[PDB]
Design a protein around this ligand. Sequence first.
Ligand SMILES: [Mg+2]
Ligand SMILES: [Zn+2]
Ligand SMILES: [Zn+2]
Lengths: 263, 49, 49, 147, 140, 388, 97, 66, 113, 63, 133
Amino acid sequence: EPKVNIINAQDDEVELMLSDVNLSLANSLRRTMLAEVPTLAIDLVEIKMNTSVLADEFISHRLGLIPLVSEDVEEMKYSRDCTCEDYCDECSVVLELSARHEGEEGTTDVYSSSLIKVSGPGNLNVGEPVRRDDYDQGILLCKLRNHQELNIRCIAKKGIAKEHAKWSPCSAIAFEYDPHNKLKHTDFWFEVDAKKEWPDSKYATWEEPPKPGEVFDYKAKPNRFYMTVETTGSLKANQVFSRGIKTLQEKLANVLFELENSR
Amino acid sequence: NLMGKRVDFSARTVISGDPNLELDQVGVPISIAKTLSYPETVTQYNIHR
Amino acid sequence: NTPIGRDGKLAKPRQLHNTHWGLVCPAETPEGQACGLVKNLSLLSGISI
Amino acid sequence: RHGQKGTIGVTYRHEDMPFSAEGIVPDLIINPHAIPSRMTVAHLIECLLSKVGSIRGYEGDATPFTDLTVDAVSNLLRDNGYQSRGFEVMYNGHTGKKLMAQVFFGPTYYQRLRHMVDDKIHARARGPVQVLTRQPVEGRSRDGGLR
Amino acid sequence: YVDGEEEETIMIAMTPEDLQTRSLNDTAKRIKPEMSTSSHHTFTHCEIHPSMILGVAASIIPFPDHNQSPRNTYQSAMGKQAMGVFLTNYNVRMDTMANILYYPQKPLAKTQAMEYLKFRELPAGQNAIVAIACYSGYNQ
Amino acid sequence: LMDDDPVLFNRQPSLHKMSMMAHRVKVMPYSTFRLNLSVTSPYNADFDGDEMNLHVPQSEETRAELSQLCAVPLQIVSPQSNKPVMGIVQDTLCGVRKMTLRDTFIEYEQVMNMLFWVPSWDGVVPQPAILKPKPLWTGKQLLSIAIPSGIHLQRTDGGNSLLSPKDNGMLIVDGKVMFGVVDKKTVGSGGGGLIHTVMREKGPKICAELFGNIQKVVNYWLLHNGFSIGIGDAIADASTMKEITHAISSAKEQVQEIIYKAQHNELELKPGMTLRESFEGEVSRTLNDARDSAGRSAEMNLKDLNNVKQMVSAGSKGSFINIAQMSACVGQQMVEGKRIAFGFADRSLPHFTKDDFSPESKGFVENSYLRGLTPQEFFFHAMAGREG
Amino acid sequence: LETDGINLAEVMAVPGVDSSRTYSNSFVEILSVLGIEATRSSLYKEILNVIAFDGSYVNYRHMALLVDVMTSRGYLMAITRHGINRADTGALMRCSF
Amino acid sequence: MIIPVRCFSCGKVVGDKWDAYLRLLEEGKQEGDALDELKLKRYCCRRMVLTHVDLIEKFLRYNPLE
Amino acid sequence: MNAPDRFELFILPDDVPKLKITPDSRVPNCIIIKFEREDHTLANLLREELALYPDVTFVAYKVEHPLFANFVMRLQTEEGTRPKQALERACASIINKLKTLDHKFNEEWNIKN
Amino acid sequence: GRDPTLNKTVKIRQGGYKGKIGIVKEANGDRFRVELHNPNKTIPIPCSFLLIESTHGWVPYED
Amino acid sequence: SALFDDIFTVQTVDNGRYNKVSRIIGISTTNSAIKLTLDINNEMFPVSQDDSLTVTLANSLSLKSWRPPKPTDKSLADDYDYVMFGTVYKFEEGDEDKIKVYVSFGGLLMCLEGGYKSLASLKQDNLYILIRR
RNA sequence: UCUUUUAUCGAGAGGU
Ligand SMILES: [Mg+2]
Ligand SMILES: [Zn+2]
Ligand SMILES: [Zn+2]
């Protein structure tokens, strides 16, 4: 019964019109995509040496906000269900960074592309930071002047966007329904006119404008929805959507299991 | 030191609004609760607790 | 800072006089006991030598 | 920057905040009942002028005792593709539904003071006393007692 | 340079556009005076710019006239308590206490005088997206 | 310290005997106390950075005395004036007014929630008012769910017949609001209202549950309705502005006449007063009339959704002088009852001539805070505020 | 008539004047002329006027108590320190003030 | 102090648009067009980059105590 | 100093059932369900669906306080049907819908690339 | 002292604090108090959950 | 079954203050001295000036916890287009042949003025109003 | 089996 009509599709963002469903299913899909898509991110930092002009937790914060590639993150287990001690191999990805300045004139820029994956469970596609092109340098971590060594070792774990706002995959998700205002779910402020004082939502041509000789129906419900999803490169939009629906299904299946075994 | 001396078992902190309580309740933090105390008598109706 | 005191209330050395146009600031001043006493010069003022 | 002090009450997460029609969520919601009895119109004018200043792409001028009106910012913002008085159609974050009222919306410049609850909370059971009267002592960094 | 005991004897025009009385009718721009009893003036001076009558901590407020003076006072007292960056050598000094802000941002509503308070090379405060709504009720 | 202990609760400086009350404890995380907002009226408190104090009992006798003497429900009625103190404040009030209107209908899936919120509800969903073509409840019903059973109230406001064209007046029969918009004159702190009636009938504890019920319902609904103020709320039309600007012009022109008479010795002297006192009194009457006349004009133009008319019409925050001083003329500035004296010799500011006494020459502000303020007017306003 | 200056013992005795209704507001003279009871009523009337000028409304037994403490020994006993200290209460109750 | 990594309201990464922004400011472009060429349409990500104060330039010129 | 650890918004301790049910008594054939560590997403997705079957007469939910983590739900059908079975049916239906949506989305994607 | 592992550095191998450094602030019995390094908080943890540093690597409570 | 029944002609319709609610004034046709004043929702049963209404008043419909109506049962409602449920809050027995019944429909209002023998049976406590055409 | 220390006087800057 549900339907999909993709309007714009490319690498890291999708623009689609989701039709003939309910409301809280599309809304719950949105909240699920913003809240529960388990991704991967840096979690622990052990600074071996810092002699720069930046406090530590400043750096550890900036590293704490870095997007990593996580296509195969639905196989690695969580941090709480590995029976080892400290950490092993089926629970984390280990990164290391080492940079220094050399000379009297110069100001070396410590970027994020200088992060080198050391050890991780293989062969899966994780660890490497997101790169835009084939030359681009990426995020700017720090800067170093004469004789200022920096050398650190970072742990990376899996998480969701309810424990910290860093494991989140999507940025902002556009969402709307009913452009011409026909259900009368809202009212418009005006000084002279409520028609020549408002913008027209980019989608006011996909549906037809109401007739000025129309009466008021009272059985309709919000039916055709318009949504757009972005990403930061850590995932690709189709994977975000599919993983969202999969997670929601798993949740409902869990609740049903509780109801059944509670007998 | 006689009309207005200093007392014990006091608490001083900042207020905050909350519309989901009933008219005569108050919200005590966890720390102020684990610092303040109350003496209770051991009887036959509460020895288990 | 003007040393007139804190007692005797009075509202004559605390008000803003008409001759304070451009020589002192009208708005910026502390509050409580020293309202109108403590002054802060304007942005284009100067003291003779 | 207009004598409008206030503290944090509760903290909501991203998906619960009333997201606008485009996806922009507000970070700080303040309360209409603080304006009409205090009359600080320069707060609203500041918000609108900052909205336009960010949309067109430059730091907007705002010197007192000049010629900058409100109908000018109205015409500019109306031309750049928005509702002139900065109102927006917004949805509820809980059940995705158009609110029956539009919300004044925009970036303002806020600043954070030096009064923290982590530097004011205090309590005592049985700490030290004085020597002269054997009463509780005066202080906070000494497990003191209240008066 | 004029002082206070001399200011009694002079006669000032507020703006240069007043030194030559004009030859309008608008609801946005304010109503300027008329000088009802003066069909001919002989002005002897001119204020440089009338916004110079303010202080230092009062030149931070944008549009410091669309308000009510106790708010210019409260703001003039709270502008001296905000965190930020006090100097650029916080690493080498050893004072008693010091507060720093991670990511300072210069404002979007600038008064001209700010240019001389170094108030966009050492700002103290952040821009933020603000909405005004009677929401769930925790903001009262 | 655990759940349901009775602790004494205090703010400095305490004045009347309502500033020390015993509350029940409820453990919560984070670092701050919590209050129900309805107890912000005896404490003279607000959440803009204040502090308060908690005192703990010890033995049993004093706990009994706290729970039986210093409780909150036993303090709802003040012996100072034979009238209550705790009422409805802020959003709950504005949106209970917005909820109890005559054109407000709710559909079923929302009424189910709004009825499940009430902690003291029984379990009988009331019938709608439009059984067909579509079940639609109103607001007076889902408000009348909160009120207990057996209450009667009858109030006439302005002498309206029992048909109620302007929806004023109030009729409560057996706890069912027949007609009448519920605002401050009912659920506030006035004598003869709802809180005083229920208090003097069903007991104190029931009145201690009424607040919770109503606040939960109204907060849910207003949460699903929203409310906001804008700059366009403070902008009048071009029709009224020309009317306002003209009313001041004739007032100003009138002033020119009084000065003329006083300078040609043709003015009547008032008993007990010198000539100049009578003159100053006259001017002030004319200008204050003008401000009120202009302010009354702007107030009456406004439409029936200018948010400010809802926050003032609800009586929750503000009153007429605010709309007047935002849309019409700011008006007069006073210093010790008299006006901006002559600090300089025989003139107010050096930007004016000598012996100048037009309106703007001694303080009469002429704009509104939306337009702007000239420097002199700003200076005088700062002077008045400093006086305050 | 509303006149300036007080002199009751003479204005009461003037032909044309309703000598029974003449009233003042310097209740010291009212005590020196009409006794303690009329002074009580006059003092109450004064406090009622003062509080009642600005919309505020007190309930009566409080003000009646206050005005029936000042005049309950034979003369006006003002509330400062001279009028109180001269009573016969305990020494601690008076030294604690 | 230094350019942030994420945004503050939405989370669109703006930690790699400072060098291109400065370089486009050398070529004589305008801030509106220098942001229209960096693809920033929602004015939150725009205000994040338009009002930044780069302070590390100073923090380096003090010779190292280490 | 007094902050709740974040992960306590979705990790269940041992001595807490994920789901608890208690029958209400003021009316017959109505039950109260208590959900741990869930929010508006699950609750609404269930509520709008149960609020459709022509045999369930009253369904609702509420979240008591937003600082904690739970919600409570009231369910009342008619005399013929037992509410628990109806709840299960709704869960199954919603799962079916999600499956169909995923399928058609994947088809449209592989066609659109 | 009243135990041989007080004030000695520790690593946590189970629980929500797994992989975090700490110091034994108080080890009265079975339930220890480890002062975590990472946020300013001292947590209650069972002694079974700790690795202690010794001459060769992180040893369990056999030190 | 039905307590009262008559045919009216809408003469004046007042909007003014509100949008959804209009107030209609009506005089009958077969007899004068029977005036009806009613409030109604516009966007459900819209009215106009100079029309005709078939009005019925009944204390019950059938030929407590409310529940959605089944599509397989019926009543007196399947013959009409606008049904409201209301309470009576004043019953006057004034001078001469005058009776004024004040019925409040859950907030909206209705005043019914008529003779004695015609309205003397409307002394219930809950009334259903039914409107056709 | 507990226990376990915070000078004093004065001055100023602040928050409701
Ligand atoms: Mg306060
Ligand atoms: Zn492991
Ligand atoms: Zn952003």
